[PDB]
């Protein structure tokens, strides 16, 4: 069985996630509406709102607050698009092969994302990633542990206190691995599967940074982004 | 009577304005919706869209295109909020004392603007300005001439070719003054009235820059602005 320290970590992570992911999606009506690069305004707002949520989630991870502000920014700039891809799995549906956020207005199929300036070189692996992650049938606990582990990866450009963050991510990996053993029947191969998805996210991050570069180099498109998106996905150090 | 050169200038300005002001206001549905700082997202989009329109208007003013890009930026940064205040008179209604843009969703009373972070120190003079300008009952020709004259003011921080722009604004003032004499019955005092409104706009510009400074110094608010708003109302040279 798991210890109290590990149990408190799971509780903190679940609560943090319930505090920052609204299953009702009612805030989506405040975004610039979708149009079917007609979808860029709506998806820019969607991602902008999602980044604020990830920041809120990160601040409630045990020990993340105790990092320097530079390390927190470092981690968030490298990992934000990855956490968004992970957290979005919760709206992803295998039936529709789309992200369904509580209404046909906010049902995003792949072709919607084409009209925000992305190509299949990103959307193909993205959707296969969502499919595979959805098939893992992760417990809520496992889902939130993976986001925290992804966020707390020391192997990011810009990180200062490599030792401290690797310790944090070590703790979470131990929690996850113990959780999968005790609470997840038939979980013998699950941890390795989850670690592989982390590797998949690195390649999706790379392809996304590529396509974001092309858009942000055209002011008529980058002007449709939000200030927070420009800050987080931008290249400043 | 007026000459052909002056007549062509009036025609060019009217056409430019008809090309950049949509009386149907149908684009407003694409803005983040209004909420009744709940109105900041919607009004930020409104102003952002209006700035693009003013740029489009400026580019069709005779001779503005022939300025250096620095002078064009100089003029636009100083004068954008003034042209917006002028051009908005076309949606302003004396009956409602509001700006009515083709629907109750896009009817902006003063209290809406309070919920975007402004105080009566701006909204009081703004609305009195709209009232007085509305009472002048300007001809379309006179309305567009005043916007071009306001845009082409050499007395702006940053302007390089003071002589060239003053010549341009001289030409337009001559056109306006001749137009008011020949085509506007009872226009004997109109030119002076219009020149005074230009002075009124300087003070509204000043009060607005003040309140924009306070908002933009709070990132939780400035993050709701658009990139174009931040560029134009910002202080870079």
């Amino acid at each position: 069985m798991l210890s109290d320290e590990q149990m408190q970590i799971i509780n903190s992570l679940v609560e943090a996630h319930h505090k920052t992911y609204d299953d009702s999606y009612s805030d989506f009506v405040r975004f610039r509406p979708p149009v079917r690069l007609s979808m860029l305004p709506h998806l820019a707002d969607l991602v902008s709102y999602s980044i604020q949520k990830v920041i809120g989630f990160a601040k409630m991870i045990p020990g993340f607050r105790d990092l320097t502000a530079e390390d927190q920014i470092a981690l968030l700039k490298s990992s934000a698009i990855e956490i968004i891809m992970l957290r979005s799995n919760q709206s992803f549906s295998l039936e529709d092969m789309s992200w369904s956020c509580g209404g046909p207005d906010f049902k995003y199929c792949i072709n919607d994302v084409t009209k925000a300036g992305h190509t299949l070189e990103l959307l193909e692996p993205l959707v296969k990633f969502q499919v595979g992650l959805k098939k893992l049938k992760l417990h809520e606990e496992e889902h939130v542990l993976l986001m925290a582990i992804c966020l707390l990866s020391p192997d990011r450009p810009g990180v200062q206190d490599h030792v401290r963050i690797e310790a944090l991510q070590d703790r979470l990996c131990d929690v996850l691995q113990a959780y999968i053993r005790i609470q997840h029947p038939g979980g013998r191969l699950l941890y390795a599967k989850m670690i592989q998805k982390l590797a998949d996210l690195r390649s999706l991050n790379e392809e996304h940074s590529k396509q974001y570069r092309s858009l942000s180099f055209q002011p008529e498109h980058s002007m449709q982004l939000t200030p927070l998106v420009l800050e987080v996905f931008g290249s400043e150090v | 009577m007026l000459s052909d050169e002056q007549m062509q200038i009036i025609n060019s300005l009217v056409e430019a304005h008809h090309k950049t002001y949509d009386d149907s206001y149908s684009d407003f549905v694409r803005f983040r919706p209004p909420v009744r700082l709940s109105m900041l997202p919607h009004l930020a989009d409104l102003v952002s869209y209006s700035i693009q329109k003013v740029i489009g208007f400026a580019k069709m003013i005779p001779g503005f295109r022939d300025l250096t890009a620095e002078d064009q930026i100089a003029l636009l940064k100083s004068s954008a909020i003034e042209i917006i205040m002028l051009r908005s008179n076309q949606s302003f209604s004396l009956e409602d004392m509001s700006w009515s843009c083709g629907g109750p969703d896009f009817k902006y009373c003063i209290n809406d603007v309070t919920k975007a972070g402004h105080t009566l120190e701006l909204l009081e003079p703004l609305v009195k300005f709209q009232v007085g300008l509305k009472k002048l009952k300007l001809h379309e020709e006179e309305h567009v001439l005043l916007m071009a004259i306001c845009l082409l003011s050499p007395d702006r921080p940053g302007v390089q070719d003071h002589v060239r722009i003053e010549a341009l604004q001289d030409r337009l003032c001559d056109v306006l003054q001749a137009y008011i004499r020949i085509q506007h019955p009872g226009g004997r005092l109109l030119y002076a009235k219009m020149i005074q409104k230009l002075a009124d706009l300087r003070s509204l510009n000043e009060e607005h820059s003040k309140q924009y400074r306070s908002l933009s110094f709070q990132p939780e608010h400035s993050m709701q602005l658009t990139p174009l708003v931040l560029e134009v109302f910002g202080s870079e040279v």
Binding site: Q52, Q72, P227, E231 | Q218, P219, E220, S222
Partner: peptide
Amino acid sequence: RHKILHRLLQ
């Protein structure tokens, strides 16, 4: 630099 991120992070 990182004006918004520093806020938000409190």
